[PDB]
RNA sequence: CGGUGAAAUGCGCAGAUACCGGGAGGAACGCCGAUGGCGAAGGCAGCCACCUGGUCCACCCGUGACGCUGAGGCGCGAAAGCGUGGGGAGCAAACCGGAUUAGAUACCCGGGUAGUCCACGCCCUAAACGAUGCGCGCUAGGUCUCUGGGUCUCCUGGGGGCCGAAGC
């Protein structure tokens, strides 16, 4: 899980890309709660947060496929 | 929106005895505030049908108290409307 | 009034003289709308996840201003005029919500 | 809102026995007290003492039941099988002395409120009065 | 090329399709998103700011029964539908053609006007459904979950679910 392999970080700091990146998939998509390892309230916020970081082009909106 | 600053001012202006927070006069005066603010807000956003309910609600509540006043001591009622300016 | 975070993003290909020009504007603009700055952070150039206006990079500014409510939307309208200033975002300053701690 | 006191009471009583509790609480009030006053002296219940729950006055009505049955479902006969308000609010029913009802071939009892006070059908008649006929109970 | 069970109608040598770059515009808003949240209902999901309603918890501070319901009245009221004007990407009644079939005024395929988006005004219905009027009290628990307070491996308040005593 991503919460377990990571430390103390602000859920609201929409700039910190070095962190958020771990919350997106191999594609641009946002990890599901099963992955992130977050809570009900926690995820709700990460949603809003990335949705922001995206806009200031710090986080993608979508990626392409890799392995091959 | 209404602020602590402004609000408290409103209470002070109306209370019975300095350290009082809830009493008819107060309660009334108060809504009245909120209402008026809604009023001014509904002149615009004529399309905000929702809050307009909270408005009726507020209005009902207000009247519910006045009718009580007209019940207990009229003296207060008579005086209170003038001080607020309603069904004078 | 309320605290805010003012995200501003402008052209990455700006020279010494030009950049400080745009910055200048912003500064004067803020005061025209009453926003006193509590502090600013200049991260500067960072690579964009996606290309903004055909250009893959951007210059980054941040501004914790404490301006008047009614005029926040406007503040931006004025800010969104320069053809060099490409992204703008004004946010309410929210108490940082800790996690995994 | 609580629209009828007594009514609630009766129902707390009714509702408690059915599950088989030892005693049940209930908002106090001189009147309600006079009804419980009857029950116990009539034997439908053990008794009741005044009490305070977190600062408020309450009446602990102590329940009374029958013996443990045999066979399956040894749920004891209840001392109070039936118990219902007769005169409700918004349909009050006052009776004349002649008109006082005999309950369950006189096995149950009836409780009114006369000007000579809250009574039992038997007492009322012995007393030559009539009044608000509060309830049937047997 | 497209499309189908197959096919054809259509579009392409004025050069389509697949591919790169640029520009216009409308609609809608993936993932997060749930068996979730909110609201009186109808209904509500990109992000931001302003304006605004309701609601929950803790303290127990103030008023002192000021409460409930609610004929008629007033407002809200999906979709479609009507007026004036604007807008029109995609979808698409009617309508034009294509194939299927004993036939097809259909189900499938290609087009296509109202309409669907916006503003003002009207319409006001509905499986407008929990098919379950509103308010107060009382009657074993278990478990999952949203959310708040606490001395937080447990307690306590509010909401949404499943199983279930008594009872029905």
UniProtKB/Swiss-Prot annotation, chain A:
<dbReference type="GO" id="GO:0070181">
    <property type="term" value="F:small ribosomal subunit rRNA binding"/>
</dbReference>
<keyword id="KW-0687">Ribonucleoprotein</keyword>
<protein>
    <recommendedName>
        <fullName>Small ribosomal subunit protein bS18</fullName>
    </recommendedName>
</protein>
<keyword id="KW-0689">Ribosomal protein</keyword>
<comment type="subunit">
    <text>Part of the 30S ribosomal subunit. Forms a tight heterodimer with protein bS6.</text>
</comment>
<keyword id="KW-0694">RNA-binding</keyword>
<comment type="function">
    <text>Binds as a heterodimer with protein bS6 to the central domain of the 16S rRNA, where it helps stabilize the platform of the 30S subunit.</text>
</comment>
<dbReference type="GO" id="GO:0003735">
    <property type="term" value="F:structural constituent of ribosome"/>
</dbReference>
<dbReference type="GO" id="GO:1990904">
    <property type="term" value="C:ribonucleoprotein complex"/>
</dbReference>
<dbReference type="GO" id="GO:0005840">
    <property type="term" value="C:ribosome"/>
</dbReference>
<comment type="similarity">
    <text>Belongs to the bacterial ribosomal protein bS18 family.</text>
</comment>
<keyword id="KW-0699">rRNA-binding</keyword>
Swiss-Prot record, chain B:
<keyword id="KW-0687">Ribonucleoprotein</keyword>
<keyword id="KW-0699">rRNA-binding</keyword>
<dbReference type="GO" id="GO:0006412">
    <property type="term" value="P:translation"/>
</dbReference>
<comment type="similarity">
    <text>Belongs to the universal ribosomal protein uS15 family.</text>
</comment>
<dbReference type="Pfam" id="PF00312">
    <property type="entry name" value="Ribosomal_S15"/>
</dbReference>
<protein>
    <recommendedName>
        <fullName>Small ribosomal subunit protein uS15</fullName>
    </recommendedName>
</protein>
<comment type="function">
    <text>One of the primary rRNA binding proteins, it binds directly to 16S rRNA where it helps nucleate assembly of the platform of the 30S subunit by binding and bridging several RNA helices of the 16S rRNA.</text>
</comment>
<dbReference type="InterPro" id="IPR000589">
    <property type="entry name" value="Ribosomal_uS15"/>
</dbReference>
<dbReference type="GO" id="GO:0003735">
    <property type="term" value="F:structural constituent of ribosome"/>
</dbReference>
<keyword id="KW-0694">RNA-binding</keyword>
<comment type="function">
    <text>Forms an intersubunit bridge (bridge B4) with the 23S rRNA of the 50S subunit in the ribosome.</text>
</comment>
<dbReference type="GO" id="GO:0022627">
    <property type="term" value="C:cytosolic small ribosomal subunit"/>
</dbReference>
Swiss-Prot record, chain C:
<keyword id="KW-0687">Ribonucleoprotein</keyword>
<dbReference type="GO" id="GO:0003735">
    <property type="term" value="F:structural constituent of ribosome"/>
</dbReference>
<protein>
    <recommendedName>
        <fullName>Small ribosomal subunit protein bS6</fullName>
    </recommendedName>
</protein>
<dbReference type="Pfam" id="PF01250">
    <property type="entry name" value="Ribosomal_S6"/>
</dbReference>
<comment type="similarity">
    <text>Belongs to the bacterial ribosomal protein bS6 family.</text>
</comment>
<dbReference type="InterPro" id="IPR035980">
    <property type="entry name" value="Ribosomal_bS6_sf"/>
</dbReference>
<comment type="function">
    <text>Located on the outer edge of the platform on the body of the 30S subunit.</text>
</comment>
<dbReference type="InterPro" id="IPR014717">
    <property type="entry name" value="Transl_elong_EF1B/ribsomal_bS6"/>
</dbReference>
<comment type="subunit">
    <text>Part of the 30S ribosomal subunit. Forms a tight heterodimer with protein bS18. May make transient contacts with protein uL2 of the 50S subunit during translation.</text>
</comment>
<keyword id="KW-0689">Ribosomal protein</keyword>
<dbReference type="GO" id="GO:0006412">
    <property type="term" value="P:translation"/>
</dbReference>
<dbReference type="GO" id="GO:0005840">
    <property type="term" value="C:ribosome"/>
</dbReference>
UniProtKB/Swiss-Prot annotation, chain D:
<dbReference type="GO" id="GO:0005840">
    <property type="term" value="C:ribosome"/>
</dbReference>
<dbReference type="GO" id="GO:0019843">
    <property type="term" value="F:rRNA binding"/>
</dbReference>
<keyword id="KW-0699">rRNA-binding</keyword>
<dbReference type="GO" id="GO:0003735">
    <property type="term" value="F:structural constituent of ribosome"/>
</dbReference>
<comment type="subunit">
    <text>Part of the 30S ribosomal subunit. Contacts proteins S2, S5 and S12.</text>
</comment>
<comment type="similarity">
    <text>Belongs to the universal ribosomal protein uS8 family.</text>
</comment>
<comment type="function">
    <text>One of the primary rRNA binding proteins, it binds directly to 16S rRNA where it helps nucleate assembly of the platform of the 30S subunit central domain. The combined cluster of proteins S8, S12 and S17 appears to hold together the shoulder and platform of the 30S subunit.</text>
</comment>
<dbReference type="InterPro" id="IPR047863">
    <property type="entry name" value="Ribosomal_uS8_CS"/>
</dbReference>
<dbReference type="GO" id="GO:0006412">
    <property type="term" value="P:translation"/>
</dbReference>
<keyword id="KW-0687">Ribonucleoprotein</keyword>
<protein>
    <recommendedName>
        <fullName>Small ribosomal subunit protein uS8</fullName>
    </recommendedName>
</protein>
<dbReference type="Pfam" id="PF00410">
    <property type="entry name" value="Ribosomal_S8"/>
</dbReference>
